[PDB]
Amino acid sequence: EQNKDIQDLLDKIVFDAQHGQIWFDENRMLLMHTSILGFLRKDLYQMLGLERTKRFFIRCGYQAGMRDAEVTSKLRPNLNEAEAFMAGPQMHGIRGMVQVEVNELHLSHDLKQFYADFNWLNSFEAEVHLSEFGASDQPACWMLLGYACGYSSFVMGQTIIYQETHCVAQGDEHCRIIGKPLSEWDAVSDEIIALQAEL
């Protein structure tokens, strides 16, 4: 019914409580509290400063994003590029991190062309950021953003960089990102962060 489009991702996810294991394909998952992420964000901040913490959370999202794309790219290979790609936004929702809503998506692997304009609703990272830091001067959704780039870059076979254009933690109403190839704008965390120092 409500899951027609994600059932193939659901079928890959196994909860085996009695043996202490959650599997997404052949990868272990953990169920964690968002407030623990908030705690870890704050503790790293104190120990290492904002840049290193930001760099940490983006790198993590980035590897997670690439891992999910390894797993989901084997699925759907009898479908067209947009439907396949949508596994990424879909995992973010299944994982409980954010709801992706597509304003605009243009993509072709062979053309090396990509452009995404998405809204992010109920970002967990904006919530835990307000909680620990109060209202922010900059977008807060570092991990989610890393995951966007990583997932997107694996699927397209080149560096796709995203920018969080509007963020719930800066008072905006929903979060929103725009994704394009590096040029139209791997330590790509440097780029994402450099990129956001563009007023």
Note the residues at the interface with its own copies (CB under 8 A): 2-3, 6, 10, 15-22, 24, 27-37, 39-40, 43, 47-48, 52, 56, 59-60, 63-64, 67, 90, 92-100, 121-124, 127
CA–CA gap between residue 67 and residue 155 (Å, rounded): 11
197 binds, among its own copies, Zn ion, none (CB under 5 to 8 A by kind): none
In the complex, minimum distance from the CB of residue 10 to Zn ion, in angstroms, rounded to a whole number: 26
Return the one option of Zn ion, its own copies, none that residue 175 interacts with (CB less than 5 to 8 A, by type). Answer: Zn ion
Q: For residue 162, which of 135, 189, 187 has the smallest C-alpha distance? A: 189
Q: Which of residues 170-189 bind Zn ion (CB under 5 A)?
A: 175
**CA-CA distance, 89 to 174, in Å (whole number)?**
16
**Beta carbon of residue 133, minimum distance to Zn ion (angstroms, whole number):** 12
Length of the chain: 199
Number of residues counted as binding Zn ion (CB under 5 A): 7
Query: Which residues does the annotation place in the binding site for Zn(2+)?
Result: 141, 164, 167, 175
Q: Which stretch binds Zn ion (CB under 5 A): 16-24, 51-59, 163-171, 189-197?
A: 163-171
User: Measured from the CB atom, is 151 or 180 closer to its own copies?
Assistant: 151
Distance from the first to the final alpha carbon of the chain? 45
Compute the least distance from the CB of residue 143 to its own copies, in Å.
8
**Per-residue 3-state assignment (H helix, E strand, C coil) for 90-137:** HHHHHCCCCEEEEEEEEEECCCCEEEEEEEEECCHHHHHHHHHHCCCC
* Binding of residue 58 to Zn ion (CB under 5 A): no
Label residues 35-47 b or e (16+ Cβ within 10 Å = b).
eebbebbbebeee
Closer to its own copies by CB, 49 or 157: give it.
Answer: 49
User: Shortest distance, CB of residue 107 to its own copies, whole angstroms?
Assistant: 22
For residue 114, give the nearest of 79, 146, 151 by alpha carbon: 151
Residue 150, phi then psi, degrees to nearest 5: -75, -50
- Please tell me whether residue 37 binds Zn ion under the rule CB under 5 A: no
Chosen from Zn ion, its own copies, none, partner binding at 126 (C-beta under 5 to 8 Å by type): Zn ion
